[PDB]
């Protein structure tokens, strides 16, 4: 049995699951989704 | 021993603040 504790805005987030990043638009409201 | 005036005062968090009162 194997458990798996996450922990949240302890610190900068060092693990993340796999998403492609893109290039940042400026000046136009955009959706934005920044280390989660 | 000796008194420790204001000193020990940091940062609680990483979170910035600014022009702000936080308790």
Same mark, same amino acid.
């Given at each position: 049995?194997?458990? =798996?504790? %996450?922990? =949240? =805005?302890? $610190?900068? $987030? *060092?693990?993340?699951?796999?998403?492609?990043? *893109?290039? =940042?638009?400026? @000046?136009?409201?955009? @959706? %934005?989704? %920044? @280390?989660? | !021993?000796?008194? &420790?005036?204001? +000193?020990?005062? !940091? !940062?609680?968090?990483?979170?910035? +603040? &600014? &022009?702000?009162?936080? &308790?």
């Amino acid at each position: 049995v194997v458990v =798996l504790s %996450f922990e =949240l =805005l302890h $610190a900068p $987030a *060092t693990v993340c699951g796999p998403k492609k990043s *893109t290039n =940042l638009v400026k @000046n136009k409201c955009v @959706n %934005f989704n %920044f @280390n989660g | !021993y000796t008194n &420790s005036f204001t +000193r020990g005062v !940091y !940062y609680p968090d990483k979170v910035f +603040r &600014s &022009s702000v009162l936080h &308790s």
